[PDB]
Every structure is written in C-alpha cells, then in structure tokens.
C-alpha cells in the first residue's frame, strides 16, 4: 500500500503518535516519507548485511529478525515479514519500543538529517484532523 | 549547556539601521530555529521573526518590510536587521532557542533606544 | 492572521490560593500553544508546552487545558515563587503571535 500524507497523519494519530515522547505528529509523517516514501511494503538491504522493513524501516540486525542476519537481537520481539501489511499497528508497536525518551527519533538517520530542523508540521496542515 | 547571548549598538540614530548578534553554544543551528522577540519598557512581549535550521525565514506581518534575518551556521551566529526606525523600536530584545513548537532557552536580552 | 486574547489582565491573591488564566484564539490552532512565565528583571521561561505538557522541573500545581480556540492555565495552591507576569503564545503556521499578559501580584 501507498499512502497519501493526510491518509497516513489520521493513522499515527489514532495510534497516538501525536506528542509521543514530545514529538509533534509532523515528526512521523516526515520519517516515513524520506524512510519508505509511504510505502508499506518497503525494503533496503544495507551494505553491512542487514534489511530494513515497512513503512518506518525497522531494522534487521537490532529490532526484528529476518533469519539472515548475523548477530541479530530481535529487541521487538517480532518477524520482519509481520512488519509489511497495509495496517501500521505493528511498526508503530515496534516505534514507540525503540523511541524510549525525548530523543529517541534519532534512530532514524534520515529524520536527524532531513526532517530535524525543519517546518515539519507544514505535512499535516490542512490535513482533516 | 545550551546558551544564548544577545550583542546590540545600544543607541542609534533614526538616520542609521539596527543590528543585533546572537551567539549560541552548545548546539548546532542546523537541527534548531531561532526567534527574536521584543519588549518596551513596562509592556508585553512581541514577536519579530524567525529562522529554520534549513535556513528559511518568517516574519511579523506589520514588520516585514523593514526587518532582516540570516545566520552563519559555522560561527554558531544568528542576525537580525531592521531599518527605518521610530522611537517606538526602543525595548529590549531577545533571541530564542525553539524546539519542536515551544522556545525553550532565551538570552538575557540587550536594551536598544532610538535616539532623535 | 491569528490574535490571541489574556485575560485577566491582573490577579490579586494569596498563598496557599488557587487561580485561572484565559487565551482564546481568533482561529483554530490545534493545540499547538505554550504558556511561560517572567520573573522582575529576568527573561520568560517555558512552563508548558503543546497546551498541556509540563516542561522539566516545573512543579506539578500547575496545569494547562484546551482545544480549538479556547485554552487556560490553572494554579493550585500557589506559592511565592509563582509571583510575577504570564504570557500564551501560539504555534499554528507564521506569523506566531503572544497574549497581552497577566500580572499575579500578592494580596
């Protein structure tokens, strides 16, 4: 599935995303976009052995496993396959694990570099919330 | 430690411009916006403007067209400029740290009055 | 563009009191407002944020509430460092604009 920004935004709030941790909901919409480009279904092999799965790409060697990857911790407790469906509650589950206090968005590499710094809330404005 | 320090000309003719430095420490301006606000002796607070750790900028809609903000992101230096100026731009300025929608470290200000 | 509308413009109170404070919003601004507070001859400090998020090492007494255009800050039993100016401001888009401030001075 491909999600559209407004369609995406009503989610994460249902699945109380909004202020999580402090973060503005704007935060998350922005991850997923430079992440998976709202892609449910997406992945990435990195050159370091691992995969990153769905829609906020959680990785293979730390948080979910994926049977192929050498010194895997499987910190969410969770398949990496369990992690592709159109419904986000899975990856949001694994999201709110990793992000244990105010700053933890910086597990995500492309937030810290694309979206930290920047008018994120402009991507739900005018959203129907 | 996160810190802010306001430097201004103090007094300045109406015949010349305004400028005020801001320098941080503690954190990089490319992950945070900075604000400036502004309070007359006795009153409430104002705000002037602002610009995003991506490098854009906003302003006060009344105060638009004779204001100017930049920075320089490896000298760790905000800059606010403001032109045409009136007895009523004397106060005291501030400039402000904002993290994800709320300012949460201010500098200690400098006082500015417009001369005749 | 968005104004924002404090009252009351003074409070005269005791310790041990409990107080109010009102911003109403011109325009819809989806929770998106902060309170801070300003001590003579200091700079303002962030209290809450996102209309009802404590900021760290504020006290518990004080608590924020809201949604749409109406918002308030409440002060139980207040004590003396609680003395001095209160300002709202908002987050929705740009231009940000302030509330015209409350002065809680000692009865």
């Known amino acids: 599935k491909v999600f559209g920004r407004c369609e995406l935004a009503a989610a994460m709030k249902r699945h109380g995303l909004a202020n999580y941790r402090g973060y503005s909901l704007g935060n998350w919409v922005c991850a997923a976009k430079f992440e998976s480009n709202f892609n449910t279904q997406a992945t990435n092999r990195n050159t370091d052995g691992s995969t990153d799965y769905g829609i906020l790409q959680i990785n293979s060697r730390w948080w979910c496993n994926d049977g192929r990857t050498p010194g895997s911790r499987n910190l969410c407790n969770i398949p990496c396959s369990a992690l592709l469906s159109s419904d986000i509650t899975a990856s949001v589950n694994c999201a709110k694990k990793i992000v244990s206090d105010g700053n933890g968005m910086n597990a995500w590499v492309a937030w810290r570099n694309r979206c930290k710094g920047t008018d994120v809330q402009a991507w739900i404005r005018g959203c129907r919330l | 430690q996160v810190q802010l320090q306001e430097s201004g000309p103090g007094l300045v003719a109406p015949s010349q411009s305004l400028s005020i430095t801001c320098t941080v420490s503690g954190f990089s301006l490319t992950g945070y916006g900075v604000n400036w606000v502004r309070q007359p002796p006795g009153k409430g607070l104002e705000w002037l403007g602002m610009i995003w750790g991506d490098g854009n900028t906003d302003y006060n809609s009344a105060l638009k067209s004779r204001l100017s903000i930049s920075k320089d992101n490896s000298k760790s230096q905000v800059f606010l400029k403001m032109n045409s100026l009136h007895t009523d731009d004397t106060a005291r300025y501030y400039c402000?740290?904002?993290?994800?929608?709320?300012?949460?470290?201010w500098g200690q200000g400098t006082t500015l009055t417009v001369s005749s | 563009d968005i104004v924002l509308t404090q009252s009351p413009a003074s409070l005269s109170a005791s310790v041990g009191e409990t107080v109010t404070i009102t911003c109403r919003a011109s325009?819809?601004?989806?929770?998106?407002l902060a309170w801070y507070q300003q001590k003579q001859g200091k700079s303002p400090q962030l209290l809450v944020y996102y209309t009802t998020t404590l900021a760290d090492g504020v006290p518990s007494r004080f608590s924020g509430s809201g949604s749409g255009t109406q918002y308030s800050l409440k002060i139980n039993s207040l004590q003396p460092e609680d003395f001095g100016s209160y300002y709202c401001?908002?987050?929705?888009?740009?231009?940000?604009?302030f509330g015209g401030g409350t002065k809680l001075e000692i009865k």
């Open positions: 401001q908002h987050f929705w888009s740009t231009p940000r604009t």
């Open positions: 402000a740290r904002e993290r994800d929608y709320r300012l949460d470290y």
């Open positions: 325009g819809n601004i989806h929770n998106y």
